[PDB]
Amino acid sequence: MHSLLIAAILGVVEGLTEFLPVSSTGHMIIVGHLLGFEGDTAKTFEVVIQLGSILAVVVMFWRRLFGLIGIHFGRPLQHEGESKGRLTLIHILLGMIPAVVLGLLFHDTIKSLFNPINVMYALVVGGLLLIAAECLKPKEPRAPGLDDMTYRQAFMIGCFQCLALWPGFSRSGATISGGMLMGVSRYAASEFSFLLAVPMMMGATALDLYKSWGFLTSGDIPMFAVGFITAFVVALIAIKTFLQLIKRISFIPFAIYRFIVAAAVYVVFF
Numbered sequence: 001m002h003s004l005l006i007a008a009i010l011g012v013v014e015g016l017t018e019f020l021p022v023s024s025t026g027h028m029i030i031v032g033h034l035l036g037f038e039g040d041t042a043k044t045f046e047v048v049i050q051l052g053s054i055l056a057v058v059v060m061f062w063r064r065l066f067g068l069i070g071i072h073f074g075r076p077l078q079h080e081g082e083s084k085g086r087l088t089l090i091h092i093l094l095g096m097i098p099a100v101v102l103g104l105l106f107h108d109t110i111k112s113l114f115n116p117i118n119v120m121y122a123l124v125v126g127g128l129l130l131i132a133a134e135c136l137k138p139k140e141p142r143a144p145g146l147d148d149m150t151y152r153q154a155f156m157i158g159c160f161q162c163l164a165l166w167p168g169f170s171r172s173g174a175t176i177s178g179g180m181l182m183g184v185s186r187y188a189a190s191e192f193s194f195l196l197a198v199p200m201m202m203g204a205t206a207l208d209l210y211k212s213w214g215f216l217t218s219g220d221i222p223m224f225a226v227g228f229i230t231a232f233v234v235a236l237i238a239i240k241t242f243l244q245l246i247k248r249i250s251f252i253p254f255a256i257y258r259f260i261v262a263a264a265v266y267v268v269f270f
């Protein structure tokens with residue numbers, strides 16, 4: 001079926017690009033345009049399949065996330081770091097505060113000024129930031145592992161997450177870049193970005209799904225579902241492959257890829 005095929009394709013796109021630093025939103029406006037799936041219900045279907053990508057992070061970091069909110073299951077938590085420190089909820093809170101504050105003050109201002117030309121610029125500037133992070137990061141990470149991160153790095157990553165309010169910038173791209181610039185290794189900054197994404201995207205999805213509840217009907221449920229679980233499965237593959245890959249390559253190829261996507265935005269919309 002046309003509808004379910006679209007849901008699977010967009011689910012694959014969402015699951016691949018939500019946690020790679022390449023702007024799921026940038027890919028979604030392109031693919032949704034090439035499939036004819038563009039209206040108000042499409043912009044809420046894409047909010048719903050973002051819950052699928054979240055769930056993949058929740059599943060992969062299950063024991064870590066529950067431990068952060070004070071629920072520890074049996075075996076002690078796997079320690080990832082060179083120090084005796086442990087990532088805490090304060091790290092997560094500090095990483096949330098800046099984008100939460102700026103998001104609440106400017107979310108409506110950003111949404112009403114949406115445009116594919118802005119996503120194109122965000123794809124380029126975000127790619128340039130990734131390049132700058134790779135070029136300017138210290139030779140020796142200050143936080144090689146997730147549990148080595150400081151309140152200060154977490155808060156600075158939180159400040160960089162405000163760049164994600166710019167559509168097309170890639171929440172993951174902004175936070176990993178800011179993390180790398182603060183001396184967090186690629187791997188640990190990627191993990192922290194994914195953990196941070198759980199409260200950020202769950203709050204953002206609940207907010208946009210509430211404001212857009214009027215569009216939905218009973219007939220969208222079968223399509224909204226197939227995209228959810230496609231995004232979930234693909235994100236599960238993507239996160240696991242990305243974390244294995246980012247130990248061996250840099251973000252230079254992702255930054256260059258974003259330049260290609262930005263050109264694709266221009267040729268598809270202009």
Ligand SMILES: CCCCCCCC/C=C\CCCCCCCC(=O)OC[C@H](O)CO
Pocket residue numbers: 012013014016017020022027248249253254257
């Ligand atoms: C949904 C639209 C498509 C999804 C968008 C995908 C974005 C991928 C872009 C750039 C990644 C390039 C780097 C990843 C490719 C590396 C392949 C590889 O094999 O690198 C291993 C190397 O040998 C080291 O060990």
Ligand SMILES: CCCCCCCC/C=C\CCCCCCCC(=O)OC[C@H](O)CO
Pocket residue numbers: 121124125128
């Ligand atoms: C498509 C529209 C996109 C619009 C936005 C694009 C604007 C580009 C801005 C800056 C790029 C050039 C950056 C300048 C590079 C400086 C390099 C440097 O300073 O070198 C120091 C060196 O590392 C000492 O060791």
Ligand SMILES: CCCCCCCC/C=C\CCCCCCCC(=O)OC[C@H](O)CO
Pocket residue numbers: 131134135250252256
């Ligand atoms: C070769 C095939 C085509 C390749 C694409 C065309 C090349 C120019 C395109 C985009 C600008 C890339 C900007 C590169 C910025 C520096 C890259 C780099 O060497 O990173 C430094 C390193 O990580 C620390 O020393």
Ligand SMILES: CCCCCCCC/C=C\CCCCCCCC(=O)OC[C@H](O)CO
Pocket residue numbers: 125128129131132135136137138139163
């Ligand atoms: C907030 C929005 C984001 C805006 C993003 C603008 C993009 C700037 C473009 C290129 C900068 C690249 C600078 C590269 C300078 C290289 C310096 C260097 O060589 O490294 C020094 C030292 O080794 C390090 O620890």
Ligand SMILES: CCCCCCCC/C=C\CCCCCCCC(=O)OC[C@H](O)CO
Pocket residue numbers: 009012013016020031034035238241242245
């Ligand atoms: C870490 C992972 C790095 C590896 C990188 C992942 C490689 C994924 C490659 C292709 C998937 C994209 C397939 C889905 C997009 C194609 C469908 C599409 O674009 O729809 C256009 C439509 O058909 C026109 O009418």
Ligand SMILES: CCCCCCCC/C=C\CCCCCCCC(=O)OC[C@H](O)CO
Pocket residue numbers: 120124128131135259260262263266
């Ligand atoms: C229509 C849309 C098409 C979009 C097209 C994309 C535009 C790419 C822009 C700038 C890339 C060049 C800026 C890279 C400059 C960084 C080089 C640098 O900073 O040097 C590395 C450092 O010295 C290491 O030691």
